[PDB]
Design a protein around this ligand. Structure first.
Ligand SMILES: O=C(O)CCC(=O)C(=O)O
Ligand SMILES: [Cl-]
Ligand SMILES: [Cl-]
Ligand SMILES: [Cl-]
Ligand SMILES: [Mg+2]
Ligand SMILES: [Mg+2]
Ligand SMILES: [Mg+2]
Ligand SMILES: [Mn+2]
Lengths: 221, 19
């Protein structure tokens, strides 16, 4: 197992700066990944998930755009402590990278979005996570689908990194951690899922961009 | 097209965690 310092500086940082996408497989190991899976399944079973929403809701149903159901987790809720461990581990990696990811100064993040595509061909249309400057600079996703066969069950995250001659197809594999720049460099989509698909996302904020975004929100722009 | 109509919602105030 690589320490956070080496994984951040010798792998995540150069991969993010060269490609804008970075995959770390077998991030937490099978035992912890299974416990996270159980916590997510209990959120699902107890009706905590609600339809995923969009930054700007207009005339169309949210379900025309994203077919997932989600809840937000801080990591200290009863029954969510292993999700909290995951979040702490993501945070430790970012802290060890901080200052070397582009020109960003990362001060904070969202709560964790625990999301489920409930099979049935649901997915997420082509989108950019942060197209207009809301502060988000890095998207971090942890996948927890044991026994996923994407050739049958679909659910690939396809990213279209700007300037590259190939797309990036990310299978939502158990215990996989993914980072990518949240801005318009990385439009992406979740292809239809034909089995229940779970993932946990946090977004990290750039300090200056997030402060500007909060100013715009608080002044009504 | 307003790309914010496709972007995943986050809370804009009250809910940011500080690292
Ligand atoms: O689950 C994933 O692979 C990505 C989900 C996604 O693009 C989003 O929720 O903004
Ligand atoms: Cl890059
Ligand atoms: Cl930083
Ligand atoms: Cl696109
Ligand atoms: Mg919630
Ligand atoms: Mg809860
Ligand atoms: Mg398929
Ligand atoms: Mn996305």
């Amino acid at each position: 197992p690589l320490p956070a310092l080496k994984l951040a500086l010798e792998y995540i940082v150069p991969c993010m700066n060269k490609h804008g996408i970075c995959v770390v497989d077998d991030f937490l190991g099978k035992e912890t990944g299974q416990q996270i899976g159980d916590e997510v399944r209990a959120l699902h079973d107890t009706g905590k998930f609600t339809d995923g929403q969009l930054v700007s809701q207009k005339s169309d149903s949210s379900k025309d755009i994203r077919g997932d159901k989600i809840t937000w987790i801080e990591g200290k809720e009863p029954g969510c402590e292993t999700i909290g461990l995951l979040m702490s581990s993501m945070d430790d990696l970012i802290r060890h990278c901080n200052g070397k990811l582009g020109s960003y100064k990362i001060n904070g993040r969202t709560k964790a979005m625990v999301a489920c595509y409930p099979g049935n061909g649901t997915g997420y249309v082509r989108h950019v996570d942060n197209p207009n400057g809301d502060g988000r600079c890095v998207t971090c996703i942890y996948y927890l689908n044991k026994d996923w066969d994407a050739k049958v069950s679909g659910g690939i995250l396809r990213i279209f990194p700007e300037g590259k001659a190939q797309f990036a197809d990310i299978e939502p594999k158990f215990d996989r951690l993914l980072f990518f720049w949240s801005d318009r460099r990385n439009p992406h989509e979740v292809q239809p899922a034909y089995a229940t698909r779970y993932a946990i996302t946090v977004w990290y904020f750039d300090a200056d961009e997030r402060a500007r975004a909060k100013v715009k929100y608080l002044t009504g722009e | 097209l307003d790309l914010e109509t496709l972007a995943p919602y986050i809370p804009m105030d009250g809910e940011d965690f500080q690292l």
